[PDB]
């Protein structure tokens, strides 16, 4: 009971995917999640209550 997902694209602008099967009983044995790419800068660059529209003054 296998999974097929896409490969990271290389040297050019269907054969661009790979297949994987897990052979172990523990999730710890699995390979790394190198393909997950989320992001949320907000937690850090903009943790202000009161939304700053910035195109407007920011004070006044």
């Amino acid at each position: 009971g296998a999974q097929v997902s896409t490969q990271k694209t290389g040297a050019h602008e269907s054969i661009i995917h790979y297949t994987n099967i897990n052979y172990y009983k523990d999730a710890a044995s699995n390979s790394a999640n190198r393909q997950d790419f989320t992001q949320d800068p907000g937690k850090f660059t903009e943790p202000v209550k009161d939304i700053m529209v910035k195109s407007l003054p920011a004070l006044n």
Partner: protein, 289 residues
């Protein structure tokens, strides 16, 4: 998604440059108030006329998983095949990632981290220097044994303790691929803690810092052939590759060099390198001065 799975699509594209023309208004994006504690969200198109650019650049290699997930040496020690010291016949340390800096500074960029770990061991042996050097020693077989806190500790290379009826052990023979195994997230807490501004005792004393939170046991490694006519010595190197990672509350990267393993101690060090004057910009572009 589920941060335990070895597969998961989606390209991490950066932002396109929106085409921008001339402007005369009350919009004042380039004027903000840094006091609020907010970082400005201005892009080139807010301050100069820009063309449109379809940007394909991705941030794949700066994802926390790809940044930490590379085996790093976190420890190395020696032990002899034969000696009068008994002690020198096996190696042992206390698990931690605080004894080799590269790995340590990488982890310390985050206050808390959670992950499984792929441990890989590189073991090598050399024949000790001496007057007589001829012998024919068969292949060396080693035993690596993990002792969770509280387990009986070996007192000699031949202690009953190496029976490992329950501790996990690895037997490996030289010449083969380096030994390797995965260890799950083993903490007593919800995330491994890299810093702890606290004490072990309730009376605000005892031991301060990281150490009070550690306690992940230790590793013992010995030869199993146990002998060699002439002295030999082996070195065991252990590597950690965290995988299936999660990290919280980032902090500045360590600036001062590390002084020891149990503390965060440091000597005052320079903010950065000096330069001649606040206006100094070297002249490149000259018929070579």
């Amino acid at each position: 998604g589920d941060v335990v799975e070895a597969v998961e699509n989606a390209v991490a594209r950066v932002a396109d440059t929106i085409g921008s023309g001339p402007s005369n208004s009350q919009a004042v994006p380039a004027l903000t108030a840094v006091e609020t504690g907010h970082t400005s969200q201005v892009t080139p198109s807010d301050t100069v006329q820009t063309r449109h650019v379809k940007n394909y650049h991705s941030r794949s290699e700066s994802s926390i998983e790809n940044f930490l997930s590379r085996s790093a040496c976190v420890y190395m020690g020696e032990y002899h095949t034969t000696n009068s010291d008994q002690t020198k016949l096996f190696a042992s340390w206390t698990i931690s990632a605080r004894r080799m800096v590269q790995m340590r500074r990488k982890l310390e960029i985050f206050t808390y981290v959670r992950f499984d770990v792929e441990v890989t061991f590189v073991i090598t042996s050399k024949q000790d220097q001496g007057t007589q050097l001829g012998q024919d020693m068969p292949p060396l077989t080693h035993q690596i044994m993990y002792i969770p806190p509280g387990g009986p500790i070996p007192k000699s290379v031949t202690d009953y303790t190496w029976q490992t009826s329950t501790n996990p052990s690895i037997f490996w023979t030289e010449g083969n691929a380096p030994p390797r195994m995965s260890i799950p997230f083993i903490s007593i807490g919800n995330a491994y803690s890299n810093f702890y501004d606290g004490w072990s005792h309730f009376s605000q004393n005892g031991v301060y810092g990281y150490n009070t939170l550690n306690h992940m046991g230790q590793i013992y490694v010995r030869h199993v052939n146990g002998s060699s006519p002439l002295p030999m010595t082996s070195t065991v190197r252990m590597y950690f590759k965290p995988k299936h990672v999660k990290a919280w509350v980032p902090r500045p990267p360590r600036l001062c060099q590390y002084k020891n393993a149990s503390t965060v101690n440091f000597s005052p060090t320079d903010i950065t390198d000096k330069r001649n004057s606040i206006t100094y910009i070297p002249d490149t572009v000259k018929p070579d001065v």
